[PDB]
Design an enzyme around this catalytic site. Structure first.
Site, mmCIF file in Angstrom:
data_model
loop_
_atom_site.group_PDB
_atom_site.id
_atom_site.type_symbol
_atom_site.label_atom_id
_atom_site.label_comp_id
_atom_site.label_asym_id
_atom_site.label_seq_id
_atom_site.Cartn_x
_atom_site.Cartn_y
_atom_site.Cartn_z
ATOM 1 N N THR B 1 0.853 -1.220 0.000
ATOM 2 C CA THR B 1 0.000 0.000 0.000
ATOM 3 C C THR B 1 0.873 1.250 0.000
ATOM 4 O OG1 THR B 1 -1.853 -1.082 1.062
ATOM 5 C CG2 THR B 1 -1.732 1.295 1.346
HETATM 6 CL CL LIG Z 1 0.745 -0.956 4.198
#
Ligand SMILES: [Cl-]
Ligand SMILES: *[C@@H]1CC(=O)N(CC)C1=O
Ligand SMILES: *[C@@H]1CC(=O)N(CC)C1=O
Ligand SMILES: [Cl-]
Ligand SMILES: [Cl-]
Ligand SMILES: [Cl-]
Ligand SMILES: [Cl-]
Ligand SMILES: [Cl-]
Ligand SMILES: [Cl-]
Ligand SMILES: [Cl-]
Ligand SMILES: [Cl-]
Ligand SMILES: [Cl-]
Ligand SMILES: [Cl-]
Ligand SMILES: [Cl-]
Ligand SMILES: [Cl-]
Ligand SMILES: [Cl-]
Ligand SMILES: [K+]
Ligand SMILES: [K+]
Ligand SMILES: [Mg+2]
Ligand SMILES: [Mg+2]
Lengths: 238, 198, 221, 230, 237, 239, 196, 222, 230
Positions: B1
């Site tokens: 992410t």
């Molecule tokens: Cl993350």
């Protein structure tokens, strides 16, 4: 609030429990219910308060409840209270069987429920249960047995007794006719019809009879069919 | 992410990649990691998907009720505070790094970081595993007084760079601009994603 | 906080007056009728209002339905409990609750409010219909928690007159189509459009309310 | 109208099976001295109520009987003021909690049912009193269109084409019956009170199919309706 | 017109009163008189102690709370100890946490908050005790009075108990000179005020007088019996 | 006999216990609040029951937050407990939401607490009314009043206690919206001296507090020197 | 380790247990008794963890005695065995498990003699003969070899003596004396200790 | 749960609920206890039907092997007290490894009864008890408990209906000559009962446990 | 009906008033404190010759250095006596010293006024008993009185029970500070004799002393006979 509290669990100045006594008044207005001990079994005979023509009759009985393999009972008083108590009797019986892996002796079942009823008269500030119960059963200790309990949580064993409507008149007839230690199931049946004949103000639709016997070392509890309840015809000859 | 948010004069720009992994399997390649918390308040989610979804849903509830009681648009700082309270109180049970960004009439465009541990700081902000790789870039590229268009470009570039290097980042770039006039969302996919030679 | 003493107690003559007063609320309610046919059961009741917004005839499960006479809000409590009791049974046994089992459990709840602390009894009687074991069922449950199985009955205003009307016009062999007809006529004795009555049926296909269109057709007879 | 024991003090049944304490709660609604009207059409639902500001020292902006429960649900409260506010908070709670648990906005019928079910408890448990107030809810339903719902201290509730609450409830019901939306509501309230309003003397709330968000009309917006009706 | 309004602390009368609270205040009036007064440096408590008979000891009226706080009581003895214990605990808690004495005004606030709770709850009753509180802290000497109503007062001087009205009369007459008194003169003022409560025949003795003193350089100390003789010796009849 | 419990309605739909608690407020001496251009001013007629009491005893003005003042009338013990409720509510708000509680929200929250005491036989209604006053640049000046029933409204000017109607008459004469707090303290002092029943109650202390732009949004006691000027103005105005 | 043995005959049950209480490398007691009288015709023999053994056995004892006082008659051996098992099984997954191994021996008027085996997990089995302890490993096969259901009390005692002699010969622990008891229609009888 | 104060003081220092509990005792069947030289005897009035099972309705009950009791008053309340005492007898054997003394169990029963006179939400027990047995040194014992929780030891005593008359009989009749033999000890109990009275009788001897006498054996004395 | 924690208009707790009245139903107990020790004497009040006098226990040992005479409702006192016994042993355990007579009295009186219907099943009423605590600590011999209100006080000589007013008059006449213990024993027996209903003998009274020299001593039958002879 002390204002609204009816104080259901106190003594009167005479040492009486008013709620208990008013509960027993309720029972005296309930359907007649009697039990008779014999040498070869026990029976329950109940007056059906149903009586209406448009009733459906979905159960095998209306006033006689099986409690376990070796025991049944019948009730006089508030029907809804009887449902609570009979459910509780089934639970106690199962709790005993779980623990000991043998059926609960009859008196032990009666004592256990009476302790619950007694509690309602001493603490909690609730109304007592308005139920008298007749218990029939067999155990390996005392064989065929008949018990009665009332709202205060008192019980006693009987060879014959009656609760509900006109029970005083019934208990009189029993004292006269009951041959202690000489009763068979056939003669006990006869006496039951004879007692219900006087106290009830007789039809096969208006009564309910259950018998408890032993067959091949196993208890049989059966509610007599309408055809068998032939018993009314056998009396009217006498 | 990789997640990121930038303040400009009159609002904020948020951005995220769209990769959700179990180990090194991509379970979702088009994840939406920018979650609306109110009309003009968003959060960017990183860490445990279970944790950030649960915390976001809870804050949405809390801020929504609060907003009705007060009969006013909520402060971004209030949204951040609600995240911080939960992330701090349950720091031993959560794996959540949040960025809260949005606009309110009182303070304008605001960005708050709530990292793991549940501290809260106003900042632009970056987070996620992929953010390691773009600290140098953002430190070198950031300029005070950037327009909205420049913030979108800055965010798109930074995310693209992180997405190239970080195996746990990738997919599409989700962008959101928040101002008084409302929320504008777009997706950068394929050729739309900024490209850099090897 | 809450009162721990009973608000229902025995009177000197052995009566529970709160239950009797609860029955006075029932008898003052709008009339309801239940008729068990050979192949089904029918429940019927009398009702600026949007008549479709609230219902008196209510499903409990796919095969069980209910109606009442007495206090509407008290009924809603028992509807919620009944639905809940039916699901708790299903979760354990993975089988739809028999009608009789549902009635027993609901009647048990009604008993509680005649004995528990700081509460009054419910001012409602219930008519519960159901289909299980390829057989129809009709039960009544009173404010005390006593329940009865009926071939046909009536409750609410003019229930005494309704019952003798049914005693004359009901036979066991009557099928469901005919049972609906005679149920409407029973309400007509103390009353009519498809907007001011509600009818529910129960057979093999389960329990459903009759649609306003369906009711309009039966009124044409 | 017979009585026995404490049947007028707590919610136990009277000999004819009545709850006096519940009946007295309806009387409490009228202690406010205000009347509210609600009507729905195909396109919208409207609530109109009286706004009495006798003092002048009051900040009139804080004197309201219109409440946002959610973005899409408004209500008007009639009766005891503090009881009313309490029921508004509970409605807001139930609606927020519903959205959280189920992931969609509470239907107006369901919110009304919930509030009514809560009120039922006060009619059965002896230790608290019923709330001396009345709630009317408006909102757009996706399938059914504009909705008007009302619940009372007895725990009754219903959907309406139009309804009223307060002092001139019966007179308003008469008027509304004879008629079967914003113009209708203002006219009804003006007739039963025999007033003819200034824009500062009423409050108006609306939800429409085109604009589902609950909206309270400004003084200028109300005036344009009063001027048109003139 | 009062019978049904006077049994429960949760019942307002039509006149906007609570009779149980008023009745609880009668309990302090039944107690023997106590006086409290202060200068700029000292706070002093003086109390009359009852004895049921000659062979019984005189009942304690002055209680130690902390090094900087003492109390005099009037009313239900049991409520007095229950409140004294609470006060002692609050002082211990303060020293434990902050390593400094609990400011006197903060303790009194805690008392008011505590004694208000039973005045609003069904089946509960007010504290049937009134306190005079003598203390010294950063803000100098203090005399506070607490009531069954849970109200409290900051006093230049005060008297509570039976016939205390005449002690209050003395105090008002002389309070303009209290601030500038040395300790000896301040105690005598307290003794004179307390003497007003006595019938004309009765006198202050070493058996019936109890004195408590706290000040700038003196921890709260209680004087009884032989210890009160120095204070009585210079008193004019 | 319908007046013993807050859980009991009378046949005409009244809750007499709440009304009886309101009577306790009506027997109290007067407190007033006036919202002006740039803040809120509070004044209390504080009756001197004894000369033995210290000047400052039995305060009827409280800080419930740094930006919120509270003025009370009625049973003082009940008022003090409500001050604690309000303080706890303001404290909790800051902890949860991370900013100063808006006055309207604080009023609503405390009012709902007051209301909760009007439903049950288990507890009795508070015998006190109070005013909450606050100022900030964003919200401006706000003045709310809560009564024993739990009703809460905002006001330009407000009075509670025995001379409430007489106080309002005087307050209505002011164009408070256009006036500063400095002018209002004098007017508050004046109105208290007017409504003071000199024949029935002797001796009172004037208690004054304010919150506004001049105090930088902090609720504070009016300085002694300004208070004395207001007392002199009120005294000379009364002739 | 502690040793328990039971042998059910036609109208009697014979039981024996070692009399040692051990701690580390020493015998601390040589006249220890591991048998608990439940009623007139029931013995519970209990071994296992210190503390647990006496706590559990005495709890069952007092409960079996309470049953008699409440009801006027005694639990049957089978009822007592199941009661014991219920309690032990109920505590198995609780904060207070009991690490005990048991034999229950009894005579019922209607059912005749009975011997029950229970392990610490609370599995209950009726057996014509049974043994607990490490000693059981050396003695169970001797029982299997020589036992018949019609064995007389005289032979049972000699068969017990064979098992005990095997322990003297082959078992690594010093177990010199054993308690011996028999239960029949006339109740519990103390036999002579078997000593080496 | 229910917290109403049921037993409270009245203006003269009376505890009315306890006094009403004592009235419940007087409605009970007469029970007589006599302590002999080496025997203790209990006798109770039985009011009974012909159709009744005698075994089920007994007013004499064993608490332990060495202790038994008789009661008068509410029979349901009695069953509760008896079973409480039975549990306590076992708890004592468990903790002290000795049987209870007659005095210990009396003290326990009495304090139980006392607690029900000072606890919220409960009414007092409506029974009195006569408790008999032997101590370790073989001393015969007879105690009485009542609803208030007072207990005392007696040479002889009566409780229930017409207890006052029976007590006055025993006062004039309880001599050395009357308790000189076991036959005369039983006789004195029967005589005491025949003064107000169909009778149930039980004997307890030194370390010999409770023995209930047959109806044929009781008919011999009458 | 009223609650247990109700004040009278005179500012008295009714239940406490009524509990003090119950002491007057009790038999007379006397305590005298000398420099040589403290003595306690109590009337047994035998109600029947069939009752065993030794089963009437109205003087009990708290610890080796403290005795306790009781009057009123004796069953109520047993739980107070237990609290005193446990508390002295708790003090020994913690501090390895004997607890003073005053401290024991204080601990027992803490129980009083701890009644009320607000759990669950706590004390519903005050204790209807008065106590005399007599013992020896470092302050020398000491006698304390405690009544149902929880008030306790040191006494030179005190009588409690039905005939306490008359007995107290007798005590104030005969008592002096320099009085010996043997005199005190005789004094209380003379006073008990005159105030008792029954004729005083060796079986219908109890007597106990605590001295600086020796532990709590209950007088045997033979020791009582010696004291009476005079
Ligand atoms: Cl993350
Ligand atoms: C609620 C509103 C309505 O029309 N009904 C049926 C009469 C209700 O019960
Ligand atoms: C509170 C105030 C007052 O006058 N009293 C009585 C002396 C209190 O206790
Ligand atoms: Cl079974
Ligand atoms: Cl949400
Ligand atoms: Cl992080
Ligand atoms: Cl992060
Ligand atoms: Cl991806
Ligand atoms: Cl209660
Ligand atoms: Cl539902
Ligand atoms: Cl349906
Ligand atoms: Cl006061
Ligand atoms: Cl005073
Ligand atoms: Cl033992
Ligand atoms: Cl008696
Ligand atoms: Cl006394
Ligand atoms: K990648
Ligand atoms: K209610
Ligand atoms: Mg996790
Ligand atoms: Mg362990």
């Amino acid at each position: 609030s002390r204002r609204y509290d009816s104080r259901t669990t106190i003594f009167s100045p005479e040492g009486r429990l008013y709620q208990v006594e008013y509960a027993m008044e309720a029972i005296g207005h309930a359907g007649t219910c009697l039990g008779i001990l014999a040498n070869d079994g026990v029976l329950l005979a109940a007056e059906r308060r149903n009586i209406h023509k448009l009733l459906d009759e979905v159960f095998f009985s209306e006033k006689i409840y099986k409690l376990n393999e070796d025991m049944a009972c019948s009730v006089a008083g508030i029907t809804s209270d009887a449902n609570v108590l009979t459910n509780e009797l089934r639970l106690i019986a199962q709790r005993y069987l779980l623990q000991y892996q043998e059926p609960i002796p009859c008196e032990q079942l009666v004592t256990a429920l009476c302790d619950i009823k007694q509690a309602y008269t001493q603490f909690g500030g609730k109304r007592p249960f308005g139920v008298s119960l007749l218990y029939i059963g067999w155990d390996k200790h005392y064989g065929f047995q008949l018990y009665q309990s009332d709202p205060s949580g008192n019980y006693g064993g009987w060879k014959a007794t009656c609760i509900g409507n006109n029970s005083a008149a019934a208990v009189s007839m029993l004292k006269q006719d009951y041959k202690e230690g000489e009763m068979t199931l056939k003669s006990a049946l006869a006496l039951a019809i004879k007692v219900l004949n006087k106290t009830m103000d007789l039809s096969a639709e208006k009564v309910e009879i259950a018998t408890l016997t032993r067959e091949n070392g196993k208890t049989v509890i059966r509610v007599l069919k309408q055809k068998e309840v032939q018993l009314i015809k056998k009396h009217e000859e006498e | 992410t990789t997640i990121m948010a930038v303040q400009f004069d009159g609002g904020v720009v948020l951005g995220a990649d769209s990769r959700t992994t179990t180990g090194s399997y991509i379970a979702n390649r088009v994840t939406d990691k920018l979650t609306p918390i109110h009309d003009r308040i968003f959060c960017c989610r990183s860490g445990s998907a279970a944790d950030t979804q649960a915390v976001a849903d809870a804050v949405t509830y809390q801020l929504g009720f609060h907003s009705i009681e007060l009969n006013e648009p909520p402060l971004v700082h209030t949204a951040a505070s609600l995240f911080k309270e939960m992330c701090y109180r349950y720091r031993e049970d959560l794996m959540a790094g949040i960025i809260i960004a949005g606009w309110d009439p009182q303070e304008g465009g605001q960005v708050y970081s709530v990292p793991m541990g549940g501290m809260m700081v106003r900042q632009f902000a970056i987070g996620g595993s992929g953010s390691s790789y773009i600290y140098g870039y953002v430190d070198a590229t950031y300029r005070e007084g950037m327009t909205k268009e420049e913030c979108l470009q800055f965010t798109a570039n930074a995310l693209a760079l992180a997405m190239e290097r970080d195996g746990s980042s990738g997919g599409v770039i989700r962008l959101a601009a928040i101002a008084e006039s409302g929320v504008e969302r777009q997706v950068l996919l394929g050729d739309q994603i900024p490209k850099f030679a090897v | 906080r809450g009162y721990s003493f009973s608000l229902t107690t025995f009177s000197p003559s052995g009566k529970l007056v709160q239950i009797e007063y609860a029955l006075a609320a029932v008898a003052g309610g709008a009339p309801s009728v239940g008729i068990k046919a050979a192949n089904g059961v029918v429940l019927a009741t009398e009702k600026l209002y949007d008549e479709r917004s609230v219902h008196k005839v209510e499903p409990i499960t796919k095969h069980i339905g209910l109606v009442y006479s007495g206090m509407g809000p008290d009924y809603r409590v028992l509807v919620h409990r009944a639905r809940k009791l039916a699901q708790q049974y299903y979760l354990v046994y993975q089988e739809p609750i028999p009608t009789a089992q549902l009635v027993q459990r609901v009647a048990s709840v009604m008993q509680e409010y005649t004995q528990s602390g700081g509460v009054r009894p419910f001012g409602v009687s219930l008519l519960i219909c159901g289909w299980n074991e390829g057989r129809p069922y009709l039960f009544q449950s009173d404010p005390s928690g006593a329940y009865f199985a009926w071939k046909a009955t009536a409750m609410g205003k003019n229930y005494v007159n309704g019952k003798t009307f049914l005693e004359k016009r009901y036979n066991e062999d009557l099928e469901l189509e005919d049972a609906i007809h005679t149920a409407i006529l029973t309400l007509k004795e103390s009353f009519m459009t498809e907007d001011n009555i509600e009818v529910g049926i129960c057979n093999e296909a389960g329990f459903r309310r009759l649609t306003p269109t369906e009711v309009k057709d039966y009124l044409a007879a | 109208g017979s009585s026995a024991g404490f049947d007028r003090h707590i919610t136990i049944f009277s000999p004819e099976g009545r709850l006096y304490q519940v009946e007295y709660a309806f009387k409490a609604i009228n202690q406010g001295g205000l009347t509210s009207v609600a009507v729905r059409g195909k396109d919208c639902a409207v609530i109109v109520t009286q706004k009495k500001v006798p003092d002048k020292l009051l900040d009139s902006s804080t004197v309201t009987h219109l409440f946002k429960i959610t973005e899409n649900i408004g209500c008007v409260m009639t009766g005891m003021t503090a009881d009313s506010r309490s029921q508004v908070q509970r409605a807001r709670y139930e609606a927020a909690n519903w959205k959280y648990k189920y992931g969609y906005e509470i239907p107006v019928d369901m919110l009304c049912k919930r509030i009514a079910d809560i009120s039922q408890v006060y009619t059965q448990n002896a230790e608290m009193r019923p709330l001396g107030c009345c709630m009317i809810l408006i909102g757009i339903d996706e399938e059914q269109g504009p909705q008007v719902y009302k619940c009372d201290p007895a725990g009754y509730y219903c959907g309406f084409k139009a309804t009223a609450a307060g002092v001139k409830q019966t007179e308003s019901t008469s008027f509304l019956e004879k008629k079967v939306t914003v113009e209708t509501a203002i006219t009804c309230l003006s007739t039963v009170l025999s007033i003819d309003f200034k824009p500062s003397e009423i409050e108006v709330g609306v939800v429409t199919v085109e604009n589902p968000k609950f909206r309270i009309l400004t003084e200028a917006e109300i005036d344009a309706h009063l001027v048109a009706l003139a | 017109f009062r019978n049904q309004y006077d049994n429960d602390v949760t019942v307002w009368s039509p006149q906007g009163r609570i009779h149980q609270i008023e009745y609880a205040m009668e309990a302090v009036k039944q107690g023997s008189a106590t006086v409290g007064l202060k200068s700029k440096t000292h706070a002093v408590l003086v109390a009359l102690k009852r004895a049921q008979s000659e062979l019984a000891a005189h009942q304690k009226k002055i209680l130690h709370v902390d090094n900087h706080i003492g109390i005099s009581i009037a009313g239900l003895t049991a409520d007095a100890r229950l409140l004294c214990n609470f006060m002692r605990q609050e002082c211990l808690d303060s020293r434990f946490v902050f390593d400094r004495p609990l400011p006197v005004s903060r303790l009194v606030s805690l008392i008011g908050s505590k004694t208000q709770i039973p005045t609003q709850r069904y089946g509960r009753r007010p504290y049937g005790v009134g306190l005079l509180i003598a203390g010294y802290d950063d803000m100098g000497p203090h005399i506070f009075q607490t009531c069954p109503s849970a109200n409290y007062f900051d006093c230049r001087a005060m008297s509570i108990g039976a016939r205390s009205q005449s002690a209050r009369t003395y105090l008002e007459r002389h309070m303009s000179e209290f601030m500038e008194c040395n300790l000896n003169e301040l105690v005598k003022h307290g003794l004179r005020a307390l003497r007003e409560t006595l019938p004309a025949e009765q006198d202050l003795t070493t058996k019936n007088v109890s004195i408590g003193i706290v000040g700038k350089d003196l921890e709260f100390t209680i004087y009884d019996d032989d210890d009160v003789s120095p204070f009585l010796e210079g008193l004019e009849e | 006999g319908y007046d013993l419990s807050a859980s009991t309605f009378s046949p005409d739909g009244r809750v007499f216990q709440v009304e009886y608690a309101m009577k306790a407020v009506e027997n109290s001496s007067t407190a007033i609040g006036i919202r002006c251009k740039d803040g809120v001013v509070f004044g209390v007629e504080k009756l001197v029951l004894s000369k033995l009491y210290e000047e400052g005893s039995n305060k009827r003005l409280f800080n419930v937050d740094r930006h919120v003042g509270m003025a009370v009338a009625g049973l003082l013990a009940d008022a003090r407990s409500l001050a604690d409720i309000a303080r706890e509510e303001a404290s909790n708000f800051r902890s949860n939401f991370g900013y100063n509680i808006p006055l309207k929200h604080l009023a609503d929250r405390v009012a709902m607490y007051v209301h909760a005491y009007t439903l049950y036989s288990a507890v009795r209604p508070f015998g006190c009314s109070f005013m909450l006053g606050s100022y900030s640049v964003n919200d401006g000046a706000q003045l709310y009043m809560i009564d024993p029933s739990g009703v809460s409204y905002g006001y330009w000017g407000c009075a509670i206690g025995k001379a409430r109607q007489a106080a309002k008459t005087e307050i209505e004469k002011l164009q408070m919206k256009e006036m500063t707090c400095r002018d209002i303290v004098k007017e508050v002092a004046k109105i208290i001296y007017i409504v003071h029943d000199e024949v029935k109650d002797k001796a009172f202390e004037l208690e004054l507090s304010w919150v506004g732009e001049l105090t930088n949004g902090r609720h504070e006691i009016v300085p002694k020197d300004i208070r004395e000027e207001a007392e002199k103005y009120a005294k000379e105005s009364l002739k | 380790m502690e040793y328990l043995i039971g042998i059910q005959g036609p109208d009697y049950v014979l039981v024996a247990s070692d009399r040692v209480a051990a701690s580390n490398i020493v015998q601390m007691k040589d006249d220890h008794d591991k048998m608990f009288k439940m009623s007139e015709k029931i013995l519970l023999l209990c071994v296992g963890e210190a503390g647990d053994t006496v706590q559990f056995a005495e709890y069952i004892q007092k409960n079996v005695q309470l049953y008699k006082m409440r009801n006027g008659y005694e639990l049957s051996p089978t009822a007592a065995a199941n009661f014991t098992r219920r309690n032990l099984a109920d505590c198995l997954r609780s904060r207070t498990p009991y690490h005990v191994n048991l034999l229950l021996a009894g005579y019922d008027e209607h059912e005749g003699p009975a011997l029950y085996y229970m392990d610490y997990l609370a599995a209950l089995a009726k057996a014509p003969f049974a043994a607990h302890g490490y000693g059981a490993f050396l003695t169970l096969s001797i029982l299997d070899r020589y036992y018949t259901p019609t064995i007389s009390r005289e032979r049972a005692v000699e068969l017990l003596r064979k098992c005990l002699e095997e322990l003297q010969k082959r078992f690594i622990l010093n177990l010199p004396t054993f308690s011996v008891r028999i239960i029949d229609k006339n109740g519990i009888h103390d036999l002579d200790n078997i000593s080496f | 749960s229910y917290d109403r104060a049921i037993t409270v003081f009245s203006p003269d220092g009376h505890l009315f609920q306890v006094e009403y509990a004592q009235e419940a005792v007087k409605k009970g069947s007469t029970a007589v206890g006599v302590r002999g030289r080496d025997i203790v005897v209990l006798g109770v009035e039985k009011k009974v039907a012909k159709l009744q099972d005698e075994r089920t309705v007994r007013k004499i009950c064993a608490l332990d092997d060495n202790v038994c009791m008789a009661f008068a008053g509410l029979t349901a309340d009695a069953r509760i007290v008896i079973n409480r005492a039975r549990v306590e007898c076992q708890s004592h054997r468990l903790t002290v490894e000795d049987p209870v003394t007659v005095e210990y169990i009396t003290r326990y029963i009495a304090s139980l009864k006392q607690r029900y006179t000072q606890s919220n939400g409960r009414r007092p027990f409506g029974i009195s008890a006569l408790i008999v047995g032997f101590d370790f040194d073989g001393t015969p014992r007879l105690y009485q408990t009542d609803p208030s929780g007072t207990y005392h030891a007696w040479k002889a005593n009566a409780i229930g209906r017409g207890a006052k008359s029976v007590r006055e009989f025993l006062e004039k009749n309880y001599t050395d000559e009357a308790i000189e033999t076991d036959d005369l000890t039983i006789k004195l109990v029967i005589k005491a009962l025949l003064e107000v009275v169909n009778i149930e009788l039980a004997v307890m001897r030194r370390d010999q446990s409770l023995k209930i006498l047959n109806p044929e054996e009781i008919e011999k004395y009458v | 009906d009223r609650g247990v924690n109700t004040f009278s208009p005179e500012g008295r707790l009714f239940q406490v008033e009524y509990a003090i009245e119950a002491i007057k139903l009790g038999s007379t107990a006397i305590g005298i404190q000398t420099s040589e020790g403290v003595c306690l004497a109590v009337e047994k009040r035998i109600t029947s010759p069939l009752m065993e006098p030794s089963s009437i226990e109205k003087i009990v040992e708290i610890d080796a250095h403290i005795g306790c005479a009781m009057s009123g409702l004796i069953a109520d006192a047993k739980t107070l006596i237990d609290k005193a016994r446990v508390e002295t042993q708790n003090h020994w355990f913690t501090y390895n010293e004997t607890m003073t007579v005053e401290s024991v009295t204080q601990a027992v009186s803490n129980l009083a006024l701890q009644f009320g219907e607000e759990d669950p099943g706590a004390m519903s009423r005050p204790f209807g008993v008065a106590l005399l605590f007599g013992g020896v600590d470092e302050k020398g011999p000491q006698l304390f009185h405690m009544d149902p209100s929880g008030t306790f006080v040191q006494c030179d000589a005190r009588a409690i029970g039905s005939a306490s007013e008359g007995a107290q008059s007798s005590l104030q006449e005969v008592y002096h500070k320099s009085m010996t213990l043997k005199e005190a024993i005789k004094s209380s027996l003379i006073i008990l004799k005159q105030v008792m209903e029954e004729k005083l003998n060796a079986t219908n009274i109890e007597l106990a002393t605590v001295q600086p020299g020796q532990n709590f001593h209950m007088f045997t039958k033979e020791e009582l006979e010696e004291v009476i002879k005079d």
